[PDB]
Design an enzyme around this catalytic site. Structure first.
Site, mmCIF file in Angstrom:
data_model
loop_
_atom_site.group_PDB
_atom_site.id
_atom_site.type_symbol
_atom_site.label_atom_id
_atom_site.label_comp_id
_atom_site.label_asym_id
_atom_site.label_seq_id
_atom_site.Cartn_x
_atom_site.Cartn_y
_atom_site.Cartn_z
ATOM 1 N N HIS A 41 0.946 -1.069 -0.067
ATOM 2 C CA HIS A 41 -0.136 0.193 -0.117
ATOM 3 C C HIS A 41 0.840 1.331 0.063
ATOM 4 O O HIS A 41 0.222 2.484 0.152
ATOM 5 C CB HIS A 41 -0.886 0.061 1.169
ATOM 6 C CG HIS A 41 -0.476 0.167 2.475
ATOM 7 N ND1 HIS A 41 -0.436 -1.058 3.434
ATOM 8 C CD2 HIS A 41 -0.142 1.232 3.186
ATOM 9 C CE1 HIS A 41 0.208 -0.576 4.382
ATOM 10 N NE2 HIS A 41 0.259 0.607 4.403
ATOM 11 N N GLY A 143 3.923 5.749 10.343
ATOM 12 C CA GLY A 143 5.195 5.873 9.720
ATOM 13 C C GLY A 143 5.881 4.378 10.210
ATOM 14 O O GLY A 143 6.864 3.970 9.816
ATOM 15 N N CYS A 145 4.888 1.378 9.381
ATOM 16 C CA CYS A 145 4.600 0.398 8.503
ATOM 17 C C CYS A 145 5.761 -0.225 7.937
ATOM 18 O O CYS A 145 6.593 0.668 7.645
ATOM 19 C CB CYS A 145 3.479 0.662 7.449
ATOM 20 S SG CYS A 145 2.115 0.958 8.214
HETATM 21 C C1 LIG Z 1 1.312 2.443 7.463
HETATM 22 O O1 LIG Z 1 1.267 2.430 5.923
HETATM 23 C C2 LIG Z 1 2.599 3.757 7.723
HETATM 24 O O2 LIG Z 1 3.280 3.652 8.585
HETATM 25 N N1 LIG Z 1 2.498 4.750 6.624
HETATM 26 C C3 LIG Z 1 3.337 5.483 6.612
HETATM 27 C C4 LIG Z 1 2.872 6.982 7.379
HETATM 28 C C5 LIG Z 1 2.788 6.990 5.890
HETATM 29 C C6 LIG Z 1 -0.065 2.964 7.924
HETATM 30 C C7 LIG Z 1 0.326 3.269 9.714
HETATM 31 C C8 LIG Z 1 -1.056 3.322 10.599
HETATM 32 C C9 LIG Z 1 -0.589 2.396 11.594
HETATM 33 N N2 LIG Z 1 -1.086 1.815 7.686
HETATM 34 C C10 LIG Z 1 -2.053 2.274 7.136
HETATM 35 O O3 LIG Z 1 -2.140 3.394 6.799
HETATM 36 C C11 LIG Z 1 -3.146 1.275 6.977
HETATM 37 C C12 LIG Z 1 -3.645 1.076 5.425
HETATM 38 C C13 LIG Z 1 -3.524 -0.453 4.979
HETATM 39 C C14 LIG Z 1 -4.926 -0.827 5.187
HETATM 40 C C15 LIG Z 1 -5.844 0.421 5.171
HETATM 41 C C16 LIG Z 1 -4.823 1.634 5.219
HETATM 42 C C17 LIG Z 1 -5.014 2.622 6.300
HETATM 43 N N3 LIG Z 1 -4.252 1.925 7.467
HETATM 44 C C18 LIG Z 1 -4.615 1.804 8.786
HETATM 45 O O4 LIG Z 1 -3.860 1.122 9.605
HETATM 46 C C19 LIG Z 1 -6.021 2.605 9.278
HETATM 47 N N4 LIG Z 1 -6.788 1.418 9.922
HETATM 48 C C20 LIG Z 1 -8.036 1.121 9.148
HETATM 49 O O5 LIG Z 1 -8.357 1.707 8.162
HETATM 50 C C21 LIG Z 1 -8.906 -0.001 9.892
HETATM 51 N N5 LIG Z 1 -10.134 0.268 9.315
HETATM 52 C C22 LIG Z 1 -11.355 0.492 10.221
HETATM 53 O O6 LIG Z 1 -11.224 -0.187 11.172
HETATM 54 C C23 LIG Z 1 -12.655 0.800 9.488
HETATM 55 C C24 LIG Z 1 -13.907 0.797 10.088
HETATM 56 N N6 LIG Z 1 -15.001 1.194 9.556
HETATM 57 C C25 LIG Z 1 -14.990 1.682 8.317
HETATM 58 C C26 LIG Z 1 -13.756 1.509 7.503
HETATM 59 N N7 LIG Z 1 -12.565 1.140 8.276
HETATM 60 C C27 LIG Z 1 -8.381 -1.166 9.410
HETATM 61 C C28 LIG Z 1 -8.305 -1.438 7.916
HETATM 62 C C29 LIG Z 1 -7.965 -2.833 7.469
HETATM 63 C C30 LIG Z 1 -8.431 -3.948 8.333
HETATM 64 C C31 LIG Z 1 -8.624 -3.704 9.811
HETATM 65 C C32 LIG Z 1 -9.242 -2.554 10.190
HETATM 66 C C33 LIG Z 1 -5.760 3.576 10.238
HETATM 67 C C34 LIG Z 1 -7.015 4.266 10.804
HETATM 68 C C35 LIG Z 1 -4.481 4.663 9.657
HETATM 69 C C36 LIG Z 1 -4.837 3.118 11.691
#
Ligand SMILES: *[C@](O)(C(=O)NC1CC1)[C@H](CCC)NC(=O)[C@@H]1[C@H]2CCC[C@H]2CN1C(=O)[C@@H](NC(=O)[C@@H](NC(=O)c1cnccn1)C1CCCCC1)C(C)(C)C
Ligand SMILES: *[C@](O)(C(=O)NC1CC1)[C@H](CCC)NC(=O)[C@@H]1[C@H]2CCC[C@H]2CN1C(=O)[C@@H](NC(=O)[C@@H](NC(=O)c1cnccn1)C1CCCCC1)C(C)(C)C
Lengths: 305, 305
Positions: A41, A143, A145
């Site tokens: 991603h 950050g 990931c």
């Molecule tokens: C990681 O990629 C990173 O460090 N990136 C660097 C800063 C630029 C990043 C860090 C967050 C800990 N991870 C993500 O951004 C992942 C990616 C991969 C899956 C989707 C996106 C967003 N994401 C998240 O970890 C998010 N979590 C969610 O979106 C949960 N969503 C929900 O619970 C939900 C509920 N209702 C409606 C829609 N979504 C996850 C999504 C995947 C399945 C488990 C639940 C955040 C909010 C950023 C923690």
């Protein structure tokens, strides 16, 4: 003596961490030989994440869209491919600090060390267990990931986890190094339930053995139990069933202490049905489930790497 | 999010560990520049330890009585001297893996990472606090003497602890890298009491802030308190007094959460006087005191090294 939540020495892994940037997204990658591994991603925009077609999105990218940095050294990407949920970037230089390594997939209840990193730089190391519902209770900020989890065996680093995402309950999900998620999760921004979390029974027993080895014995009793009757009680308290293979892996600790496995289960049964009555075991008021039998044996016999 | 007992990445320290043998005693040393540091009791026999005259014992030794090994490389000792409770062995080779380092003496309640080693080889890494009574609750087996504790600041390893001995209560005692013991202890095999251990109040407050940052808020209340009245209650529960300088070091966490320090103390006061009523904070049923304010800020803001 003493007993601590101990991680593996992290030096071998530190030399593998790099920073990967695609577009406006920067995260961590793992540099082994001439390949950098990172979450796929990295290629998506905010908008893409609700329903991404990773195949189509990666087709739009070129090698020069990926900036890999190892320290101040900018690495040149010469090829990119996708393996399940991880992106593999071919670079023009093999990492000189590459160790004897292998990719392994751990089973629920096994433990590993996490090297938490930001911008390709390590921030800290801690020990985690893969929960029975295939989440981990980590410490990861934006950050992080691409941070990895690993075990060491002799001289061989077994990589088992790469961090991808956080659930709304605060727990964490990711893949093995072949890119397959632990658990039912997919890398899309939708609601995705983790199953019921249960307590890792074989690990609680391992920790009770650790306590006996360290002189905390008050919970030993004259009672014993069959494995079926133990499981009847343990499942009422949301403990995982104990299998005969679990009984066998606790064998070394049983032999060292002289306490049969089913006698220790009788002690655990009474703890579950009556509580600790304000007492502690190894300083803890709750039963600990993030030490495996091998973790206890390694820590109480002094295995080195 | 999430909050874990996190150690510093250990790579810089791993490259400094060596094995030191004198007579039939083998333990660990720290190799910085052309000096190896280790506990001075490497020179004693079993019999010597009841009442050793380390000056006279070291005078009987020669440079060749010390075998220092870095991996398979046997290092040649070209000079030996004693600094308080540590022996300094001059060797004919500067360690190429020496980092930017300094020797520091930590204060009671500060935390550090321990790299536990055996035969000069690292076995694991964990985080410890210096207790108010100058012991640490480590995990050390026979052969771990000479293992070190450290913090990292930017690129500088601050060495603060070298392991020497275990007390009959299972806790651990050692020196700084200038050889002075933490606490009242002397390196002789006699009964030596550690004082009363108390709870590190400023660290408990730091951890309650960590909990708020992670969404665990149930313990916040409408009450407040003066610092004197808080200390009146806290000393009844064997908590260390909270000072105005502690209040100042909690400033960053107060500002980030918007909860004044004395308002958090009012929450801690109620927890002490009523318990948690079967609830948990960050998954724990007991109040945690081995995270400093800086530890919380580093972990919840993502500082790297
Ligand atoms: C990681 O990629 C990173 O460090 N990136 C660097 C800063 C630029 C990043 C860090 C967050 C800990 N991870 C993500 O951004 C992942 C990616 C991969 C899956 C989707 C996106 C967003 N994401 C998240 O970890 C998010 N979590 C969610 O979106 C949960 N969503 C929900 O619970 C939900 C509920 N209702 C409606 C829609 N979504 C996850 C999504 C995947 C399945 C488990 C639940 C955040 C909010 C950023 C923690
Ligand atoms: C360390 O040198 C090592 O790893 N050596 C390698 C294997 C060859 C070694 C490891 C033990 C964790 N440390 C010691 O051997 C130290 C040295 C330095 C001080 C005396 C000796 C013995 N020792 C210990 O840690 C012991 N602990 C004690 O002797 C306590 N003694 C008593 O509590 C006591 C009570 N009544 C009468 C006499 N002594 C210590 C001694 C120092 C003050 C605090 C209490 C053992 C028993 C080995 C843990």
């Amino acid at each position: 003596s003493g007993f601590r939540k101990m991680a593996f020495p992290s030096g071998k892994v530190e030399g593998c961490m790099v920073q990967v940037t695609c577009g406006t997204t920067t995260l961590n990658g793992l540099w082994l030989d001439d390949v950098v591994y990172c979450p796929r991603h990295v290629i998506c925009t905010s908008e893409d994440m609700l329903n991404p077609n990773y195949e189509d999105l990666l087709i739009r990218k070129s090698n020069h869209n990926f900036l890999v940095q190892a320290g101040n050294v900018q690495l040149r990407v010469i090829g990119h491919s996708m393996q399940n949920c991880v992106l593999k970037l071919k670079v023009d230089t093999a990492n000189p600090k590459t160790p004897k390594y292998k990719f392994v997939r751990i089973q629920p209840g096994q433990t590993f060390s996490v090297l938490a990193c930001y911008n390709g730089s390590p921030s800290g190391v801690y020990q985690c267990a893969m929960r029975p519902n295939f989440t981990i209770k980590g410490s990861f900020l934006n950050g992080s990931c691409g941070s990895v989890g690993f075990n060491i065996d002799y001289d061989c680093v077994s990589f088992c986890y790469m961090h991808h995402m956080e659930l709304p309950t605060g727990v964490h999900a990711g893949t093995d190094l072949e890119g397959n998620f632990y658990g039912p999760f997919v890398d899309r921004q939708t609601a995705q339930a983790a199953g019921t979390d249960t307590t890792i029974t074989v690990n609680v027993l391992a920790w009770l053995y650790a306590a006996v080895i360290n002189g905390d014995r008050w919970f030993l009793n004259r009672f014993t139990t069959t494995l079926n009757d133990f499981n009847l009680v343990a499942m009422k308290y949301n403990y995982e069933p104990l299998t005969q293979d679990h009984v066998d892996i606790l064998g070394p600790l049983s032999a060292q202490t002289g306490i049969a496995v089913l006698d220790m289960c009788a002690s655990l049964k009474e703890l579950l049905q009556n509580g600790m009555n304000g007492r502690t075991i190894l300083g803890s008021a709750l039963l600990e489930d993030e030490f495996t039998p091998f973790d206890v044996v390694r820590q109480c016999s002094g295995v080195t790497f």
